[PDB]
Ligand binder design. Structure first.
Ligand SMILES: [Mg+2]
Ligand SMILES: [Zn+2]
Ligand SMILES: [Zn+2]
Lengths: 49, 1337, 99, 90
DNA sequence: CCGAGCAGCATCATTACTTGTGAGCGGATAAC
DNA sequence: GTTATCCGCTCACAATGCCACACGCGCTGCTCGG
């Protein structure tokens, strides 16, 4: 993953039960923005037609 | 339209009437042109056109020409939809049997013919010969035969002897069977017959025949000759990217069977070699069997995939059949799914919503608002606009959902709250924000738990969702009237930190002119958030109804509490905010706010509480660092001590000075003591670790540590976890459950040695596996529950009865667990409750006992209240309002319609996930009451217990019993009665390994029938030298004294049997086996002395086996009728035993396994139901012996015990309705005036209405007996069947309802849900009563 | 993912399942029980008949709501017709009572 | 502007009858547009009906008698019109 | 000739530790 | 022997919900076919 500078404190309940609050910086630095590669296969059968 | 579902067999005529042709060829589709083949499983001619209003041959393509068949391919021209209903039929070349009526135990054919199912099986499959019509020779109409027998009778006779085999044999055999003749014949023969099981079989078969003749079915229909085939639509042949088609199993089975049929017919015309046609008929029977059911008689697994083919029955039964897959719960189409987050800025009734999901859902409402606004007067342009997301669409959506509620739903909806409503708001991202409190309601964590959404669209539905399932209307859990919306964590911490008191903090000692003043002071940083100060506050008060006095008092508080006071809504007195304000305190605050100020101020108060809690928690900065959880320094020492302790204990064993088991126990005990000491050390070093100073030397205040600010606040986790963290972790469990010698000396702030972590892993994995299984088990249990009670709906308003159950404050041998006020709260009393000022009517008999009533009750300290159950209500098909008592989740009495059955089943099944898988000492003062005892004094002036069910009670001076015990038999009583004694002052002691034969008159003792060697042996105390007679009973000894038994005599100063003083009967004592007797001849006796010292689950499965009411292993034999005990002819395999009532007739002799011991001697005299042999009790016996009130109190006690053990609470109403459901059937005692048979089980409600109507007339009612069935069976034997069809079996219930013609009127939640109409429970109750009052004449 | 209206299974005119198929949600047994625990009569009613069944009913609903009218036309769950036809595939005659 | 339904159910001593009557009223107030009694505030017909209910001027008997009075007005107006038309045959 | 479709198959032993419970049936076991 | 009694054995029948995702689903020597 990533080593993140993190503090342990409630924050207006935005981390109420276990939800995790982050900083737009972690997005601007792309610290977690990942990739996903997916394939699509178009086949060409040979119908009797 | 309709109001009932008729069901019965179908004549071949009927089946053929359903048909639209006779498919002949198995082939489905031409491949060179993908067209349905003529005379095939998709033949357009036989089913319908493949394309709408388009002939197959292309001769017509116009809607006008609809209705004319073609002439080049011959197919009707309609919409393609008709290919969904046209059923086909197959002419079976030979008759054949229907597997269902033939194998579903019990075989309907077998019962119909009084024939062994083995025989009918062996004759269907062509292996034997059944002779029919029984000609003049020695042959029968029903006898089976074999090959050699067959041809031997043939050589004996070529006629008057009709032996056949296979289907047509069965057909002709049924067809000539005179039904009503056999019926009345067996009828007149029934009362003639008296052998029990014969009578039972007779009445079963006679009921079958009577239902048959009453139904329209005819026996020959039970053998198919034409076979209907499903429409082509419902068994589709969907292709793939190429010529690959998903050949549904139905098509393949149909291909197989039609192939067999064609082949067999072609053989029939072709000269028919006999053995070949025989075997082919057998094979065709097998094939049609497999088609109707791939299950029985073997397997017909598909090719290339070693797994069975989907039978027709498969498409019905199981979790995949249409019932549990598309009828009951169907995949909805209209709304959404996502994962959730918190977003606490929003009010309690609101909820988040992603803009994308919103835009996708209300798309129809979007089009509507756009068209009505004319900005897009064509649906196409509407789609374009919503595809381009021009801001116009955005604010249009914002307007269109301004009040439009929606439904948030957890995945497993355990109880009623699992689905709730909210007014949505628009946010970004893809998550679903929601208020925190309600996420605690769902048991919805934020670990990635996904929630579904559901928009209600029709106006009635939207207004409904606003009225009922909006969160702001569900604060009291319907299970227990406790508030379900409780601030759980991360907000309780905030307040608890705020409402605390640091001794010398910045600002202590000031005086504040109001809460707003102190708030301004704190925000400007001029004073701490918690320092003692003096503030003036005007706690508004509702003295009389409607008024509001305002006392501007001057209270000493903390600025924290001063600030928090700004939220209470002019109600509650200040005294509710002045304390530390823990979690339980918050629940208390919310509850009293709700009770005093209605509802709306309370929801506002809760919202404000959550807001301010989050705010001041963030302002706090509560944070857990490693140095917070301070280790108690002395712990080490303690360990060593205990360690050194166990060390020398090992010496105690290494020197053999102590036994091994006591050594183990001693290790356990010293470790437990050291654990408690180290826990108290950790606490005492944590809870008050802070030491500070106020303008002076020093003070000791409660600790401000981060830990114990979460624990003591009750925020998250209790001390049972802290002491596990800081202090010693303690012992851990072996896989079996044993305890390891050496506990985990370590802790968590310190590391763990490998082995320590290993044992911790043992424990944790056990727990995890327990949860992982109990989840599914509890799911199945709660499903059975909701099924067996899916019909109870409060319909009448007052049954107008008087039978109630005696609700009493429960006592368990310790202190009172559930006070009477906790149980009887909110339930209408049965009869007038007398003030214990006897002949003072405290409360009348139709009073909804609410809180002020229960307080007026407990004031006068009543004993127990006869109260209206639900099992005692009298209304037919549903229970009356007043019997069900106070509706929970609200305050009013129940309203007519609440499907209390379902809410009760849910409330019971939900907490299932929280389940698992010598002396008697008084405790307080008061009298010493004794029940069921015949007290005779001893020579030692004490009292002797001389019965079997002697109950000790300790009552208080105020009249309520505080303690109770079961004082065993023969235990001496060292205490009188009314003796006000303190705790621990013993009343009775005894030894469990004895069972004396205490007398009731003094004098000497004599022997009678005391024979040495034959019936008794001579055994000595070889370790002291003493001697004794060992009475071995019949079997143990030689048979020459088996039939003979001994009798000891309580003789007077002479040697003559004396009569019981008080009556006119002798008293000599038979002593059982192993009776080790010492009393010599003619020796003085003590009054009540030991003549002979005769030597002597848990989790969810417990409640499961309870509700199933299954016979517990080794049940406690009870007493059917009273009398004197005497074992009959001994050792009939079992040990027989007759008991003769004082004068009641004793035609019964119960046989108890002599292996199993016994709890009653011979010369004993006790009434019915007494424990003849100790052990668990079968609830059936409880019912059938001591009524229904006894068994229902027993069940409620049992299950409430199992739930209290886990601390969860369930109001007794729920288990109460469940027990009312599991016994609604009754078995008939006599014939009665009407036509109710003997062994005919029938709905006790229907028996009640029949007896009611008859006793209204001149006749006399029919005598019944309340039966009892496990929830499963009690659900299957339901009046309606479609319910019981859907529920669990759906292959017996269908067959039975079919053979009996069970016309099913719905009147049930299950059906009305299935068929797709309204529900009798909710507003649908109003609709149905308006239907029955007007639309039903 | 969400679903306003779209594809429908062939064997039963119920919507498909799965984000891949743009399908709806499975309103299963326990959701039904939770609903009927409240009143929830009309809600459950329309959800069973007109939301995701009764092709004529749901088409009428869509066409009626776009005209700014919220009213249900509960007909018959097509899956129930399926069940009837499937039972009738066996000798088990099953009809609808006249009244 | 409605969040709760407490006083609403206080007006009709039943929840289900409450929602049913309110639903009928709102449906009338959407299709065949009647007059929203309480002044609306850009509010759906649902909350409008619930507010009318809590005001106390709408319930089962009141709604039914208003409907029946309007229906008898329709009766008398239809009678007048059709008799005037039968006179127009002269 | 040789590729493409096709028609009814236990494809020998294809085995198969329990899951827990209930009901029924063939046959041991005892009373009249 | 009868007659019913009960018992060992056999067989049927139940197994949380969702989801999501992935993967896969006749053949084979007869039939046909040119
Ligand atoms: Mg979770
Ligand atoms: Zn044609
Ligand atoms: Zn009643």
């Amino acid at each position: 993953g990533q080593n993140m500078r993190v503090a342990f404190m409630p924050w207006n309940g935005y981390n109420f039960e276990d939800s995790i609050l982050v900083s737009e910086r972690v997005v601007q630095e792309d610290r977690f923005t990942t990739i996903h590669i997916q394939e699509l296969a178009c086949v060409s059968r040979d119908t009797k037609l | 339209e309709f109001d009932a579902i008729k069901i019965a067999l179908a004549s071949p005529d009927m089946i053929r009437s359903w048909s639209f042709g006779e498919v002949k060829k198995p082939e489905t589709i031409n491949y060179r042109t993908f067209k349905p083949e003529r005379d095939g499983l998709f033949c357009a001619r036989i089913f319908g056109p493949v394309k709408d209003y388009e002939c197959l041959c292309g001769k017509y393509k116009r809607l006008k020409h609809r209705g004319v068949i073609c002439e080049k391919c011959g197919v009707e021209v309609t919409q393609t939809k008709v290919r969904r209903e046209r059923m086909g039929h197959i002419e079976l070349a030979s008759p054949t049997a229907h597997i269902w009526f033939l194998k579903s135990l019990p075989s309907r054919i077998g019962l119909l013919l009084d024939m062994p199912l083995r025989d009918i099986e062996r004759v269907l499959y062509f292996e034997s010969y059944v002779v029919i019509e029984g000609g003049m020779t020695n042959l029968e109409r029903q006898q089976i035969l074999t090959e050699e027998q067959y041809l031997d009778a043939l050589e004996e006779f070529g006629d008057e002897f009709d032996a056949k085999m296979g289907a047509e044999a069965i057909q002709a055999l049924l067809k000539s069977m005179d039904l009503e003749q056999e019926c009345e014949q067996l009828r007149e023969e029934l009362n003639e017959t008296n052998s029990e099981t014969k009578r039972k079989k007779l009445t079963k078969r006679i009921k079958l025949l009577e239902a048959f003749v009453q139904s329209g079915n005819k026996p020959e229909w039970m053998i198919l000759t034409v076979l209907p085939v499903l429409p082509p639509d419902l068994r589709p042949l969907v292709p793939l990217d190429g010529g690959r088609f998903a050949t549904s199993d139905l098509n393949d089975l149909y291909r197989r069977v039609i192939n067999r049929n064609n082949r067999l017919k072609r053989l029939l015309d072709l000269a028919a070699p006999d053995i070949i046609v025989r075997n082919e008929k057998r094979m065709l029977q097998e094939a049609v069997d497999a088609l109707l059911d791939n299950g029985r008689r073997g397997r017909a697994i598909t090719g290339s995939n070693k797994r069975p083919l989907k039978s027709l029955a498969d498409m019905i039964k199981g979790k995949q059949g249409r019932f549990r897959q598309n009828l009951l719960g169907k995949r909805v189409d209209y709304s959404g799914r996502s994962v959730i987050t918190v977003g606490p800025y929003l009010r309690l009734h609101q909820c988040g919503l992603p803009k994308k999901m919103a835009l996708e859902l209300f798309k129809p409402f979007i089009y509507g608002k756009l068209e009505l606004r004319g900005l897009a007067t064509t649906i196409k342009a509407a789609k374009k606009m919503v595809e381009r997301e021009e801001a116009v669409v955005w604010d249009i959506l914002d307007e269109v959902i301004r009040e439009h509620p929606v439904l948030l739903n957890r995945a497993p909806t355990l109880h009623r709250l699992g689905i709730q409503a909210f007014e949505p708001v628009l946010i970004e991202g893809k998550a679903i924000q929601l208020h925190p409190l309600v996420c605690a309601a769902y048991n919805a964590d934020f670990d990635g738990d996904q929630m579904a959404v559901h928009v209600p669209l029709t106006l009635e539905a939207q207004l409904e969702a606003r009225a009922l399932m909006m969160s702001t209307n569900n604060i009291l859990s319907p299970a227990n009237g406790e508030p379900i919306i409780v601030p759980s964590q991360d907000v309780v911490l905030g307040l608890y930190y705020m409402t605390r008191d640091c001794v010398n903090a910045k600002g202590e000692g000031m005086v504040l002119t109001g809460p707003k003043e102190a708030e301004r002071l704190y925000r400007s940083g001029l004073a701490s958030l918690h320092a003692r100060v003096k503030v003036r506050i005007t706690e508004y008060e509702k003295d009389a109804n409607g008024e509001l006095v305002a006392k501007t008092s001057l209270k000493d508080t903390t600025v924290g509490r001063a600030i928090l006071w700004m939220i209470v809504p002019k109600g509650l007195p200040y005294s509710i905010v002045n304390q530390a304000l823990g979690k339980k305190a918050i629940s208390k605050m919310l509850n009293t706010c709700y009770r005093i100020l209605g509802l709306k101020p309370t929801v506002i108060f809760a919202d404000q509480i959550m807001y301010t809690g989050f705010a001041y928690a963030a302002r706090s900065g509560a944070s857990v660092g490693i140095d917070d959880m301070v280790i108690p320094e002395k712990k080490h020492e303690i360990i060593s001590e205990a360690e050194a302790e166990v060390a020398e204990i090992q010496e105690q064993f290494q020197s053999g000075l102590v036994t091994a088991g006591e050594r183990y126990n001693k290790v356990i005990d010293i470790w437990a003591a050291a654990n408690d000491r180290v826990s108290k050390a950790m606490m005492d070093n944590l809870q008050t670790e802070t030491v500070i100073n106020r303008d002076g030397q020093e003070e000791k205040q409660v600790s401000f540590n981060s830990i114990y600010m979460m624990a003591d606040s009750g925020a998250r986790g209790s001390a049972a976890q802290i002491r596990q963290l800081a202090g010693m972790r303690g012992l851990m469990a072996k896989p079996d459950g044993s305890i390891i010698e050496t506990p985990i000396t370590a802790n968590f702030r310190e590391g763990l040695n490998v082995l320590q972590y290993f044992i911790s892993t043992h424990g944790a994995r056990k727990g995890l596996a327990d949860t992982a299984l109990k989840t599914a088990n509890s799911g199945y249990l709660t499903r059975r529950l909701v099924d067996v009670a899916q019909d109870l709906v409060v319909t009448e308003d007052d049954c107008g009865t008087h039978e109630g159950i005696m609700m009493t404050p429960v006592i368990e041998g310790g202190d009172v667990k559930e006070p009477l006020r906790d149980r009887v709260l909110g339930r209408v009393t049965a009869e007038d409750v007398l003030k214990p000022g006897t002949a003072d009517i405290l409360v009348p008999r139709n009073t909804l006992l609410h809180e002020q009533w229960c307080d007026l009750l407990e004031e006068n300290s009543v004993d127990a209240v006869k109260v209206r159950s639900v099992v005692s209500c009298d209304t037919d098909f549903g229970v009356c309002a007043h019997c069900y008592g106070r509706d929970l989740a609200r305050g009013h009495i129940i309203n007519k319609g609440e499907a209390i059955g379902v809410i009760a089943a849910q409330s019971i099944g939900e907490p299932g996930t929280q389940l698992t898988m010598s002396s008697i000492q008084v405790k307080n003062k008061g009298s010493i009451k004794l029940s069921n005892v015949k007290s005779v004094v001893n020579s030692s002036g004490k009292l002797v217990i001389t019965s079997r069910n002697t109950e000790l009670k300790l009552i208080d001076e105020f009249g309520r019993t505080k303690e109770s015990y079961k004082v065993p038999y023969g235990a001496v009583l060292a205490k009188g009665d009314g003796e006000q004694v303190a705790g621990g002052e013993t009343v009775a002691n005894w030894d469990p390994h004895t069972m004396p034969v205490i007398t009731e008159v003094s004098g000497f003792v004599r022997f009678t029938d005391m024979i040495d060697g034959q019936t008794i042996t001579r055994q000595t105390d070889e370790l002291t030298g003493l001697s004794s007679l060992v009475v071995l009973d019949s079997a143990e000894r030689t048979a020459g004294g088996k039939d003979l038994r001994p009798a000891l005599k309580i003789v007077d100063a002479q040697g003559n049997d004396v009569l019981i003083p008080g009556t006119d009967m002798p008293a000599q004592y038979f002593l059982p086996g192993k009776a080790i007797v010492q009393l010599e001849d003619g020796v003085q006796i003590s009054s009540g002395d030991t003549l002979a010292r005769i030597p002597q689950t848990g989790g969810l499965p417990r409640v499961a086996d309870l509700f199933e009411a299954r016979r517990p292993k080794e049940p406690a034999i009870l007493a059917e009728i009273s009398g004197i005990v005497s074992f009959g002819k001994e050792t009939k395999g079992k040990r027989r035993l007759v008991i003769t009532p004082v004068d009641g007739s004793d035609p019964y002799e119960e046989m108890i396994p002599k292996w199993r011991q016994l709890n009653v001697f011979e010369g004993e005299r006790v009434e019915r139901g007494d424990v003849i042999s100790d052990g668990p009790e079968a609830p059936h016996d409880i019912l059938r012996l001591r009524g229904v009130h006894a068994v229902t109190r027993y069940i409620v006690n049992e299950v409430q015990d199992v739930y209290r053990l886990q601390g969860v609470k369930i109001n007794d109403k729920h288990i109460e309705v469940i027990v009312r459901q599991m016994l609604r059937k009754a078995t008939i005692v006599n014939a009665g005036s009407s036509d109710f048979l003997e062994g005919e089980q029938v709905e006790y409600s229907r028996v009640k209405i029949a007896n009611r109507e008859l006793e209204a007339n001149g006749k006399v009612g029919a005598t019944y007996s309340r039966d009892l069935l496990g929830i499963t069976k009690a659900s299957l034997a339901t009046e309606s069947f479609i319910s019981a069809a859907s529920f669990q079996e759906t292959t017996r219930v269908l067959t039975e309802a079919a053979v009996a013609g069970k016309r099913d009127e719905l009147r049930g939640l299950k059906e009305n849900v299935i068929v797709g109409r309204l529900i009798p429970a909710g507003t649908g109750y109003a609709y149905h009563q308006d239907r029955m009052r007007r639309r039903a004449a | 993912h969400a679903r306003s209206t779209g594809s429908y299974s062939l064997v039963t005119q119920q919507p498909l399942g799965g984000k891949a198929q743009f399908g709806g949600q499975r309103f299963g047994e326990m959701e039904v029980w939770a609903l009927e625990a409240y009143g929830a009569a009309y809600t459950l009613q329309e959800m069973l008949t007109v939301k995701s069944d009764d092709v004529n009913g749901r088409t009428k609903m869509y066409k009626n709501i776009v005209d700014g009218n919220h009213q249900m036309e509960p007909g018959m769950p097509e899956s129930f017709n399926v069940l009837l036809k499937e039972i009738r595939s066996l000798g088990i005659n099953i009809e609808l009572e006249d009244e | 502007a409605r969040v709760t339904v407490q006083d609403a159910v206080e007006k009709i001593g039943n929840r289900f009858d409450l929602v049913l009557v309110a639903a009928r009223r709102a449906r009338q107030m959407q299709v065949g547009g009647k007059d929203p009694l309480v002044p609306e505030e850009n509010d759906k017909t649902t909350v409008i009906a619930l507010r009318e209910i809590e005001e106390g001027l709408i319930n089962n008997q009141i709604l039914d008698v208003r409907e029946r009075q309007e229906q008898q007005e329709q009766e008398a107006a239809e009678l007048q019109a059709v008799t005037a038309i039968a006179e127009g045959r002269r």
